[PDB]
Structure formats: C-alpha cells, structure tokens
Design a protein around this ligand. Structure first.
Ligand SMILES: Nc1ncnc2c1ncn2[C@@H]1O[C@H](COP(=O)(O)OP(=O)(O)OP(=O)(O)O)[C@@H](O)[C@H]1O
Ligand SMILES: [Mg+2]
Ligand SMILES: [Mg+2]
Length: 348
C-alpha cells in the first residue's frame, strides 16, 4: 500500500501517482491520478473514529455533501473505506482537484474588480443553495472557498454546519463558540448561538472586505477584541439595534463602551467600486434582522452582470431537522458513517 510523507495513504488501484497537498488535526490531503476517469483528483484521508467530536464532524460533512448537488459547492466523487465496520479505521474522500483556495490566492495575488465580482457572485450562488436547504454553513472563510484554474469557485468544509433553528438562537453574553473568529458575526459574541442564516451573510461580508484589500477586516486576537474591531469600524450601535438585544449583560456591555463613529468604507477601501461598497455595507450590518439576505445580495446592482435567478438553483430536498448528533456515542456515529458511505462500495 502506498505511503506519503510519514503515514499510509491507501487508495489503489484506482488512484495512483499521488502527491502531498496538506494536513489536518485528524487527516491529510493529497492529489492522485484517477485511472477510471483519466483526471487528477483530490483525496482527503480522514481518521476520526477515536473521537466523538471528529465522528460528528465527519458524519455531518459526508451527509451534507452527498445530498447537495450544486456547481459552487464541492461534491464527493467517491469514498474509499474497508468493506466492514471492524476493518474500517480511515475513510478517504475523493473530490475534484481544485488549483488553490481563496486564502492562499490572497496571500500573493491582488484581485481585479472583475474577479472580486465573479468570486462574490459564486459564493452567494452556492450560499443561496445551502440556505435553501435550511442549512447554515457557519464557517465561511477564504480557506473554505476552493478555486480551479478557470476561477470556478466551490464552497467546502461543512464540518460545523447545522440545520437553521431561529427559534432557539438566543443565548447569554460571551458564550463559547466553535467557528473561525475573524469571520464571526457580532451577535455570536453578544446573544446568538449562530443558528440563523444572517451569520453566514456576515462572514461573506468579511470575505468581500478581504478580497478588496487582501487583509482581514476584523482581525481580532480574541473573543471581545473581535467586537471592538467591529465597532471601531461600524460605529456604536443605534438605540434601535440595542433595543433588539434584550439580554442585559450584552446590552449593558455595549452601553459601557465609549461612543464611536462609523469609518466610511470608502476611507478604508479607496480603490473599491462604489457598488461593491454599498453591498459590503449591507452585509456588514450590525443588526442581524436588518442585514441583507442572500437572494437580495444576488440582486444587488454590483452583481448585475451575473444575476439570473433562473440559473441560481435551490435545493430539492431541504433538511427539516438537525442530525441528532450531540448526543450519539462514537460507536453509533462510526456505524452511521459506514452506512452513509455504502453506496460507493464495489457492486451495490
Ligand atoms: N478538492 C480539493 N482540491 C484541492 N485541494 C483541496 C481540496 N480540499 C481541500 N484542499 C486543500 O488541501 C489542504 C488541506 O485541506 P483542508 O483541511 O483545508 O480542507 P477542508 O475541506 O477545508 O477541511 P478542514 O475542515 O480540515 O479544513 C489545504 O491546502 C486545502 O486548501
Ligand atoms: Mg477548512
Ligand atoms: Mg452555467
């Protein structure tokens, strides 16, 4: 069985002449040649079975990617694992090979206004499909946007995704959270569990800001510093926005801060297109109820060259309830993984 820089990477016979691409907390990524389809592919080795949290993440991502089918969301082409639950220790997920991700591209390339427009259009086209299936991604960020050599963009990484549950979104002040700090909406820090669609629109607004300047807009170093960063640019929230925060601890914290005025986006991004800044402002709205939703953003004048709602499809089959994964022991989650991957086994 083939090896790759340290650990075994066992995907023959079909996938051959492999090459290292990257690591994880509990897997690794290589490219490989696909002998049936005669193309190179990406293969992610996942070893999650020792750890309940990992099993959850892996199950969630497999179940979601297998039921989604959209041009701007990464598909699973194949899944390689042992034929029995006893012998299954690792799972390999085969996907289209993407040239790069938006994080890597932005460390070295300036994007033209045309590219920023086209990438934003594709991110919102894919997000329309995701929200239409009642799913929230929760971890949108440049490293989770894959790009190929012709600038097709696919959203990936649904490890933290959840079914939307707006009725149960409210929580206390400074409650712990999982997703990537620089792209987290202000309400996550204040009074939200991140169970509504508006948290993904905030992360897209942070990604747009980062495409315009090649630097994260709110690069907080930690938890309430992230909010300081936000308020330093957006200004103090209005009375109407604070009246929407009933939790006294979060309300009082905001009232304790010195007043700050808005820094105009054109002061921050003097080369940006004025239409892009108008859309940025609407995605980076403090009040999640006033923040633009995905279909409104697709309709914004900035995207008028690409906008066509008949070519912006929605899901056939929404998730009604969350995967009951809290919750399940490792052993049950391994069995659901084995079951969800069965369709890829020889014969069948
Ligand atoms: N389909 C793919 N094609 C090419 N590279 C990929 C693909 N999926 C991931 N990668 C890359 O392989 C390396 C490690 O993968 P990465 O862990 O970032 O993927 P992910 O879906 O974001 O999962 P994770 O939850 O581990 O971040 C990174 O450099 C990443 O950009
Ligand atoms: Mg990722
Ligand atoms: Mg088309």
């Amino acid at each position: 069985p083939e090896m790759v820089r340290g650990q075994v990477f066992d995907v023959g016979p079909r996938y051959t002449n492999l090459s290292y691409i990257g690591e994880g907390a509990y897997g690794m990524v290589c490219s490989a040649y696909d002998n049936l389809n005669k193309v190179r592919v990406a293969i992610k080795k996942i070893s999650p079975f020792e750890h309940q949290t990992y099993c959850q993440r892996t199950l969630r991502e497999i179940k979601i990617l297998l039921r989604f089918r959209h041009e701007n969301i990464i598909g699973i082409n194949d899944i390689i694992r042992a034929p029995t639950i006893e012998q299954m220790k690792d799972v390999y997920i085969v996907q289209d090979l993407m040239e790069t991700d938006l994080y890597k591209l932005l460390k070295t390339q300036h994007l033209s206004n045309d590219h920023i427009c086209y990438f934003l259009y594709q991110i919102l086209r894919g997000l329309k499909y995701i929200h239409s299936a009642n799913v929230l991604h929760r971890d949108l960020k440049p490293s989770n946007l894959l790009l190929n050599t012709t600038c097709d963009l696919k959203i990936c990484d649904f490890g933290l995704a959840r079914v939307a549950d707006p009725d149960h979104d409210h929580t206390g002040f400074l409650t712990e959270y999982v997703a990537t700090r620089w792209y987290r909406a202000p309400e996550i820090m204040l009074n939200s569990k991140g169970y509504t669609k508006s948290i993904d629109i905030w992360s897209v607004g942070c990604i747009l800001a980062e495409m315009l300047s090649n630097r994260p807009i709110f690069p907080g170093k930690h938890y309430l510093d992230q909010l300081n960063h936000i308020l330093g640019i957006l200004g103090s929230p209005s009375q109407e926005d604070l009246n929407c925060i009933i939790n006294l601890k979060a309300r009082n914290y905001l009232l304790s801060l010195p007043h700050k005025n808005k820094v105009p986006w054109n002061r921050l991004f003097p080369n940006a297109d004025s239409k892009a800044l108008d859309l940025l402002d609407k995605m980076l709205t403090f009040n999640p109820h006033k923040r633009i939703e995905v279909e409104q953003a697709l309709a914004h004048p900035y995207l008028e060259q690409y906008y066509d709602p008949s070519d912006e499809p929605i899901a056939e089959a929404p998730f009604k309830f969350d995967m009951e994964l809290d919750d399940l022991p490792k052993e049950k989650l391994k069995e659901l993984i084995f079951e969800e991957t069965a369709r890829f086994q020889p014969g069948y």
